[PDB]
Amino acid sequence: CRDLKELRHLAVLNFPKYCEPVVKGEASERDTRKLWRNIEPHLKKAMQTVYLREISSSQWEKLQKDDTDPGQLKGLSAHTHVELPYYSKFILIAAYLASYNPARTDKRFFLKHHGKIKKTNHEKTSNHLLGPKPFPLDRLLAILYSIVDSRVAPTANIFSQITSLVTLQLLTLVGHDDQLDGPKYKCTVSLDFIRAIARTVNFDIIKYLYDFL
Amino acid sequence: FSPRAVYTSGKASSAAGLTAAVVRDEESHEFVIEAGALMLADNGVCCIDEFDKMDVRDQVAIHEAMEQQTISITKAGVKATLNARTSILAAANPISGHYDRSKSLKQNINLSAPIMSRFDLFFILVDECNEVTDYAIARRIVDLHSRIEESIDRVYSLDDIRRYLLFARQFKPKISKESEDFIVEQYKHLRQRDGSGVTKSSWRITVRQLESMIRLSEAMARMHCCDEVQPKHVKEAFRLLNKSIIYCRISNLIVLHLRKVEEEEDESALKRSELVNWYLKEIESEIDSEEELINKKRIIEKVIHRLTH
Amino acid sequence: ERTSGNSQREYQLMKLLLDNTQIMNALQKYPNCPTDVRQWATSSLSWL
Amino acid sequence: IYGHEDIKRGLALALFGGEPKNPGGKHKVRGDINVLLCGDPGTAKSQFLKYIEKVSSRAIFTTGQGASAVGLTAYQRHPVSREWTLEAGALVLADRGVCLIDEFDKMNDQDRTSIHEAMEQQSISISKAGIVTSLQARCTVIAAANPIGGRYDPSLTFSENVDLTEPIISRFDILCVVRDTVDPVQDEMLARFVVGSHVRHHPSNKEEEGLANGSAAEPAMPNTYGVEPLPQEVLKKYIIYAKERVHPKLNQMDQDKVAKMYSDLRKESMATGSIPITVRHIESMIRMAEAHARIHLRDYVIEDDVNMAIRVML
C-alpha cells in the first residue's frame, strides 16, 4: 500500500484486536519487544486483504454460526464454497470446456474408437489463454448426458439454468442479444472454485481439460 | 588429465562402434565380438559433443549405459553380455544455436523424455547480457595470450591431484543414523517444485533422480576424509538442483543463514536498532580466516540496510 | 479500439503507453530499491 | 522399490508359465502367460525385470538395436570347404524359461511382424536345403515398452499410445500399467524406503551381515501385508519342485456361470465408449487357475482360484 488514507482507516480497526494484553493487565507500559509474538498469528490471516474494507467485525462472526460441519467457508473466499443445485452444479463444469476447446477435436471424450493422429503427443499457443470461445447450444445438449450417472429428461426446469444464470453473472453474452435459433454464450469465472465443488459430489475435472495432456 | 576417456562427435559414431561391433572374420569365417569405446574406458568417463548431428538408432542402443551401466548385445545367436561403469559426459546443443526466449524451455532442445529420465544431473550454461560479463572475461584472455606460461597461479600442482584419486576408493564412507530424517523431508520439496502447474511440467524428478541425489551426498564427503555423512554436506548439492535450469551469490548465503537462527529463541529482547552487534555473534563462530575482520566489518552494516530502508 | 462491456478479469488485450528508454533511467532515482528486484529488471529473465 | 503392488503380482504368476496342454482335438493351443509392461519413463521399469532373472534357473536379456530378424530364432552356410549348416538365435536356446526383451517399442517394423511365428506354436519349421526339422521352444515374452515421443498420456488408449502394431497386442494376457504423478498422500513411503535399502544394500554393511553370520544391522522392511519376505535359497528350490510334480487337470464345476456373465459386459461396453471383450479372456482363465493352484499344491482346480483370476484380467 502507498496512500495515507488507507492506513488511517485500517489502523483503527486493528486497535480492538491488539489492545487485549493492555486491558487484562498482563503487559505493562513500554514493551515493544514482547507484543509482536502474540500478534504475529493474528496478522497472518489479515495482511493478504489489502484495499478491501470488507474485513471488519463480520468476518469471524460467520464461523460462530457453523458449529455443525465447519467445512463451509463464509467470509474469507466465500465464493469457493456456495450452495448449488444438483443438476445446476454440472452446468458451470460442462460449459467451462465448451469455451476453451475446438469445435472439432471433441470426439476424444465420447467415441474412443476413432483414429488419433498424435499431433505432438504448440504448448505455448493462444489456446485456453485468449478467453472464452463462442459456443452455441448444440454443445451443451451432448455433454451433460455423459457427466451425470443415470438419464435425465430435459423438462422445463432443465433449461431454466441457462437464463437464470445470466442474472447471477456466471456467463456472458456475445455482445448484442440474439434471436432464438440457438444463441451463443461464453464464460465468466475460471476454475478457481470448480475444484472445490467437484471434491464434494465425487468428481474430477483436472483429467478432463484439453490443455493439460 | 584422465587417461580413461574418449573423444568423438555426432557423425563420427554410428549405430555401434562405441558399444560392441560384430563382423565376420576374414581368416576364420566366424562371427566374433569386438569391443567398443565404452568397454575400454571402464570405471571412467566418456566424452561426446554435438548431440544434434545424429540419428535415432544410436540413442536407443545406448539407453542401457546411464541406467544399468552394462552392454547386452546378442546378435546372431552370439551372446555378448558385458558391463561397464562409464559415465556419459554429454553436451546438448540448441536447435537454433542460441536459447530463444520466446519459445519454451522444452522447444530449444532435441532431447525427449525417455532420454532425460534415464539421465542424472542436467545443467544449463548461464547466459548473462550485462556489461560486466564481457569486461571480466576479456581480462583473462589478455593475460593468457600476453604472458605465456605465466598466468597459471595454482596452489596445488597436477602431480598431487592424481595421487588423491586412489585414496577416495579406499575407506568407503557409511550413512549416519541422523541423516535418514533429513532426506525424507527434502524430496517432498522437489516434488512440489516439479509440478509447477498441476501435475507434470518440464523436468521429471522421481525415483531415478532421488537415488542420484543420495550418491551426491555420499561422494561429497569422499574428498574431505569423513566417515559418517553430515547434514552440512548434503545441502551443498541441494543448491545445484535449484540452479540446474538456468556479486549476487554473496547475498544468497546471508538470507539462507539468518532464517535458521531466528526460529529457536524462546525469549525476545531488544536486538533491533540499539543492539546491531547481536546478529554478529552466531556468525563469527564460523569465521576463521583473515580478511573477514576488517574488510567485512563495513559490509555487515550494508546487508542489514535491506530491512531498514 | 474497443472496450468490451462483458469482459471480465481475463480478456483485456491491453498494451503499454510508455517506452523502452525512460523505464530504465527511472530506477536509480527511485527511493528504496531492493537488491533482489533491481537485478531482475535489468536482466532479460535468464533464471527460474 | 516400494509401491506398485499390482505389478509384482503379475511377475510371480508369469514365472510359472502355465501348463501348455492340448484342449482341442486337432489344433495345438499354446498355454503360456505373456505379460507386456509399459510405463512412464521415470519409475524404473527395467529394474523390475533384473530380479526375476537371478531367482530363476534360465533367463536371458537382450535389447532392441542389438538384435534383429537374423539373431532371433534361426538364420547361412559354412563358406570354408563347401558346407551347409544352419544356426539358431536366442529364443531356441531359452527353452522352458523366461525371456526378457528390452527396448521393444523402438524395434524395426520388419522385425515386429516376424516374431509372431515363435509366440503362437512354440516351434519353428526350418525349411532349408530341402531338410525340415521341428523342435520345441517354450518361452514367455516379457517386454518393456515406452510411450511415443514424450511421456505417457492416460487420455489416450494403450493400443494407440505405444508405437506398436495391432496383431502383437492381442497375444499377451496381463496389461497392468501404472502412471506416476505428484501425490502428497503417499510420497512419504517412497523417500523412506529408498534410504533404508541404501544402507542395507551397501558393501560396507555386508561385512557384518553376509560375511559375519549371525548378525544383521537392519531387519525386515515393513511390507504392505505384514508377511515376512523370502531370502534367496527359498526361490531356488521352489520352481524346480512345484512345476515338476503335481499336474492339475481340467474339471467341470460351475464353469457355465461365466458363459452368461460374459454376455453382461458384451452388451454394455459400447454403451459409453469402450471395445468389447474378445474370446482371448475366456480361454485364458485356465492359465491363472492352474498357476495359483500350484502354489497351494492342489491336484485339481478349485473355485478359489478362478475368482482371483477375474480381478486380474479386468
CSV table of N, CA and C in Angstrom, one decimal, chain A residues 68-143:
chain,number,residue,atom,x,y,z
A,68,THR,N,-21.9,-27.0,13.3
A,68,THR,CA,-22.0,-28.4,12.6
A,68,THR,C,-21.4,-28.3,11.2
A,69,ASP,N,-20.4,-29.2,11.0
A,69,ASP,CA,-19.6,-29.2,9.8
A,69,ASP,C,-19.0,-27.9,9.4
A,70,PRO,N,-17.8,-27.6,9.9
A,70,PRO,CA,-17.2,-26.3,9.7
A,70,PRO,C,-16.5,-26.3,8.3
A,71,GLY,N,-16.9,-27.2,7.4
A,71,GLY,CA,-16.3,-27.2,6.1
A,71,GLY,C,-16.7,-26.1,5.2
A,72,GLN,N,-17.8,-25.4,5.5
A,72,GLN,CA,-18.3,-24.3,4.7
A,72,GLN,C,-17.4,-23.0,5.0
A,73,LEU,N,-17.1,-22.3,4.0
A,73,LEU,CA,-16.3,-21.1,4.1
A,73,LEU,C,-17.2,-19.9,3.8
A,74,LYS,N,-17.4,-19.0,4.8
A,74,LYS,CA,-18.2,-17.8,4.6
A,74,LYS,C,-17.4,-16.6,5.1
A,75,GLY,N,-17.2,-15.7,4.2
A,75,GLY,CA,-16.4,-14.5,4.6
A,75,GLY,C,-15.1,-14.4,3.8
A,76,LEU,N,-14.1,-15.3,4.2
A,76,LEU,CA,-12.9,-15.4,3.5
A,76,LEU,C,-13.0,-16.3,2.3
A,77,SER,N,-13.1,-15.8,1.1
A,77,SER,CA,-13.3,-16.5,-0.1
A,77,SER,C,-14.6,-17.4,0.0
A,78,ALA,N,-15.7,-16.7,0.2
A,78,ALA,CA,-17.0,-17.3,0.4
A,78,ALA,C,-17.5,-17.9,-1.0
A,79,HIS,N,-17.0,-17.4,-2.1
A,79,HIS,CA,-17.4,-17.8,-3.4
A,79,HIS,C,-17.0,-19.3,-3.7
A,80,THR,N,-15.9,-19.7,-3.0
A,80,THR,CA,-15.4,-21.1,-3.2
A,80,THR,C,-16.4,-22.1,-2.7
A,81,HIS,N,-17.0,-21.9,-1.6
A,81,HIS,CA,-18.0,-22.9,-1.0
A,81,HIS,C,-19.3,-22.2,-1.0
A,82,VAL,N,-20.1,-22.5,-2.0
A,82,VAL,CA,-21.5,-21.9,-2.1
A,82,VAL,C,-22.5,-23.1,-2.3
A,83,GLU,N,-23.8,-22.8,-2.3
A,83,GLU,CA,-24.8,-23.8,-2.4
A,83,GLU,C,-25.3,-23.9,-3.9
A,84,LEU,N,-25.1,-25.1,-4.5
A,84,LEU,CA,-25.6,-25.3,-5.9
A,84,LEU,C,-26.6,-26.4,-5.9
A,85,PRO,N,-27.5,-26.3,-6.8
A,85,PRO,CA,-28.5,-27.4,-7.0
A,85,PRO,C,-27.8,-28.6,-7.6
A,86,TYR,N,-28.5,-29.7,-7.7
A,86,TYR,CA,-28.0,-31.0,-8.2
A,86,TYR,C,-27.7,-30.9,-9.7
A,87,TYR,N,-28.6,-30.6,-10.5
A,87,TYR,CA,-28.5,-30.5,-11.9
A,87,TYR,C,-27.9,-29.2,-12.4
A,88,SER,N,-27.6,-28.3,-11.5
A,88,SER,CA,-27.1,-27.0,-11.9
A,88,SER,C,-25.6,-26.8,-11.6
A,89,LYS,N,-25.1,-27.6,-10.7
A,89,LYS,CA,-23.6,-27.6,-10.4
A,89,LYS,C,-22.8,-28.1,-11.6
A,90,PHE,N,-23.4,-29.0,-12.4
A,90,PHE,CA,-22.7,-29.6,-13.6
A,90,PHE,C,-22.8,-28.7,-14.8
A,91,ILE,N,-23.6,-27.6,-14.7
A,91,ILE,CA,-23.7,-26.7,-15.8
A,91,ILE,C,-22.5,-25.8,-16.0
A,92,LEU,N,-22.0,-25.3,-14.9
A,92,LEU,CA,-20.8,-24.5,-14.9
A,92,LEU,C,-19.6,-25.3,-15.2
A,93,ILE,N,-19.6,-26.6,-14.8
A,93,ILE,CA,-18.5,-27.5,-15.1
A,93,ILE,C,-18.4,-27.9,-16.6
A,94,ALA,N,-19.6,-28.2,-17.1
A,94,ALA,CA,-19.6,-28.7,-18.5
A,94,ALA,C,-19.4,-27.5,-19.5
A,95,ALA,N,-19.9,-26.3,-19.1
A,95,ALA,CA,-19.8,-25.1,-20.0
A,95,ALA,C,-18.4,-24.6,-20.0
A,96,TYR,N,-17.5,-25.0,-19.0
A,96,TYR,CA,-16.2,-24.5,-19.0
A,96,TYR,C,-15.3,-25.1,-20.1
A,97,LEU,N,-15.6,-26.3,-20.5
A,97,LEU,CA,-14.8,-27.0,-21.5
A,97,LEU,C,-15.3,-26.6,-22.9
A,98,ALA,N,-16.5,-26.1,-23.0
A,98,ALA,CA,-17.0,-25.7,-24.3
A,98,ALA,C,-16.6,-24.3,-24.8
A,99,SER,N,-15.8,-23.6,-23.9
A,99,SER,CA,-15.4,-22.2,-24.3
A,99,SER,C,-13.8,-22.2,-24.4
A,100,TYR,N,-13.2,-23.3,-24.4
A,100,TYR,CA,-11.7,-23.4,-24.5
A,100,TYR,C,-11.2,-24.6,-25.3
A,101,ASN,N,-12.1,-25.2,-26.0
A,101,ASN,CA,-11.8,-26.4,-26.9
A,101,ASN,C,-12.3,-26.2,-28.3
A,102,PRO,N,-11.6,-26.7,-29.3
A,102,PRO,CA,-12.1,-26.6,-30.6
A,102,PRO,C,-13.4,-27.3,-30.9
A,103,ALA,N,-14.2,-26.8,-31.9
A,103,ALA,CA,-15.5,-27.4,-32.2
A,103,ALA,C,-15.4,-28.8,-32.9
A,104,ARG,N,-14.2,-29.2,-33.2
A,104,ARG,CA,-13.9,-30.5,-34.0
A,104,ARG,C,-13.2,-31.5,-33.1
A,105,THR,N,-12.2,-31.1,-32.4
A,105,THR,CA,-11.4,-32.1,-31.5
A,105,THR,C,-12.1,-32.3,-30.2
A,106,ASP,N,-13.3,-32.9,-30.3
A,106,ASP,CA,-14.2,-33.2,-29.1
A,106,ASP,C,-14.6,-34.6,-29.1
A,107,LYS,N,-14.2,-35.5,-30.0
A,107,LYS,CA,-14.6,-36.9,-30.1
A,107,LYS,C,-13.7,-37.7,-29.2
A,108,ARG,N,-12.7,-37.1,-28.5
A,108,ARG,CA,-11.7,-37.9,-27.7
A,108,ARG,C,-12.3,-38.2,-26.3
A,109,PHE,N,-13.5,-37.6,-25.9
A,109,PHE,CA,-14.1,-37.8,-24.6
A,109,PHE,C,-15.4,-38.6,-24.8
A,110,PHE,N,-15.8,-39.1,-26.0
A,110,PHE,CA,-17.0,-39.8,-26.2
A,110,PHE,C,-16.8,-41.1,-26.9
A,111,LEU,N,-16.4,-41.0,-28.2
A,111,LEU,CA,-16.2,-42.1,-29.1
A,111,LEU,C,-14.7,-42.3,-29.2
A,112,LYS,N,-14.2,-43.2,-28.3
A,112,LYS,CA,-12.7,-43.6,-28.3
A,112,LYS,C,-12.4,-44.6,-29.4
A,113,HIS,N,-13.3,-44.9,-30.3
A,113,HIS,CA,-13.0,-45.9,-31.4
A,113,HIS,C,-12.5,-45.2,-32.6
A,114,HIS,N,-12.1,-43.9,-32.6
A,114,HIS,CA,-11.6,-43.2,-33.7
A,114,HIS,C,-10.1,-43.4,-33.9
A,115,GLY,N,-9.5,-42.7,-34.8
A,115,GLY,CA,-8.1,-42.8,-35.0
A,115,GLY,C,-7.4,-41.5,-34.8
A,116,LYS,N,-6.7,-41.4,-33.6
A,116,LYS,CA,-5.9,-40.2,-33.3
A,116,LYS,C,-4.6,-40.1,-34.1
A,117,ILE,N,-4.3,-38.9,-34.5
A,117,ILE,CA,-3.1,-38.7,-35.3
A,117,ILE,C,-1.8,-38.5,-34.4
A,118,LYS,N,-2.0,-38.1,-33.1
A,118,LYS,CA,-0.8,-37.6,-32.3
A,118,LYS,C,-0.2,-36.4,-33.0
A,119,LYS,N,-0.7,-35.2,-32.8
A,119,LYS,CA,-0.2,-34.0,-33.4
A,119,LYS,C,1.2,-33.7,-32.8
A,120,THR,N,1.4,-33.8,-31.5
A,120,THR,CA,2.6,-33.5,-30.8
A,120,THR,C,2.9,-34.5,-29.6
A,121,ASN,N,1.9,-35.3,-29.3
A,121,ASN,CA,2.0,-36.2,-28.2
A,121,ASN,C,2.4,-37.6,-28.7
A,122,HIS,N,3.5,-24.9,-29.8
A,122,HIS,CA,2.5,-25.9,-29.7
A,122,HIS,C,1.9,-25.8,-28.3
A,123,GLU,N,2.7,-25.9,-27.2
A,123,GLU,CA,2.3,-25.8,-25.9
A,123,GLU,C,2.0,-24.4,-25.4
A,124,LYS,N,2.8,-23.4,-25.9
A,124,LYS,CA,2.6,-22.0,-25.6
A,124,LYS,C,1.7,-21.2,-26.5
A,125,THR,N,0.8,-21.9,-27.2
A,125,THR,CA,-0.1,-21.3,-28.1
A,125,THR,C,-1.2,-20.4,-27.3
A,126,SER,N,-2.0,-19.8,-28.1
A,126,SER,CA,-3.0,-18.9,-27.5
A,126,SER,C,-4.3,-19.7,-27.0
A,127,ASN,N,-4.3,-21.0,-27.2
A,127,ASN,CA,-5.4,-21.8,-26.7
A,127,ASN,C,-5.5,-21.7,-25.2
A,128,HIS,N,-6.7,-21.7,-24.7
A,128,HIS,CA,-7.0,-21.6,-23.2
A,128,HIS,C,-6.5,-20.3,-22.6
A,129,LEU,N,-5.9,-19.4,-23.4
A,129,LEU,CA,-5.3,-18.1,-22.9
A,129,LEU,C,-5.9,-16.9,-23.5
A,130,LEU,N,-6.6,-17.0,-24.6
A,130,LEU,CA,-7.2,-15.8,-25.3
A,130,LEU,C,-8.5,-15.4,-24.6
A,131,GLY,N,-9.3,-16.4,-24.1
A,131,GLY,CA,-10.5,-16.1,-23.5
A,131,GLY,C,-11.6,-17.2,-23.9
A,132,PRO,N,-12.8,-17.0,-23.4
A,132,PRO,CA,-13.9,-17.9,-23.7
A,132,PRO,C,-14.2,-17.9,-25.2
A,133,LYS,N,-14.3,-19.1,-25.8
A,133,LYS,CA,-14.7,-19.2,-27.2
A,133,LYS,C,-16.2,-19.2,-27.3
A,134,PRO,N,-16.7,-18.6,-28.4
A,134,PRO,CA,-18.1,-18.5,-28.6
A,134,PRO,C,-18.7,-19.9,-29.0
A,135,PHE,N,-19.6,-20.4,-28.1
A,135,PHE,CA,-20.3,-21.6,-28.4
A,135,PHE,C,-21.8,-21.5,-28.3
A,136,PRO,N,-22.5,-22.2,-29.2
A,136,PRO,CA,-24.0,-22.1,-29.2
A,136,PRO,C,-24.6,-23.0,-28.2
A,137,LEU,N,-25.7,-23.7,-28.5
A,137,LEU,CA,-26.3,-24.6,-27.6
A,137,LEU,C,-26.3,-26.1,-28.0
A,138,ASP,N,-25.7,-26.4,-29.2
A,138,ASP,CA,-25.6,-27.8,-29.6
A,138,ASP,C,-24.5,-28.5,-28.8
A,139,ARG,N,-23.6,-27.8,-28.2
A,139,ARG,CA,-22.6,-28.5,-27.4
A,139,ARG,C,-23.1,-28.9,-26.0
A,140,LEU,N,-24.0,-28.1,-25.4
A,140,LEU,CA,-24.5,-28.4,-24.1
A,140,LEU,C,-25.5,-29.5,-24.2
A,141,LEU,N,-26.1,-29.8,-25.3
A,141,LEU,CA,-27.1,-30.8,-25.5
A,141,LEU,C,-26.4,-32.2,-25.7
A,142,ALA,N,-25.1,-32.3,-25.7
A,142,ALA,CA,-24.4,-33.5,-25.9
A,142,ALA,C,-23.3,-33.8,-24.9
A,143,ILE,N,-23.2,-33.0,-23.9
A,143,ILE,CA,-22.1,-33.2,-22.9
A,143,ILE,C,-22.7,-33.4,-21.5
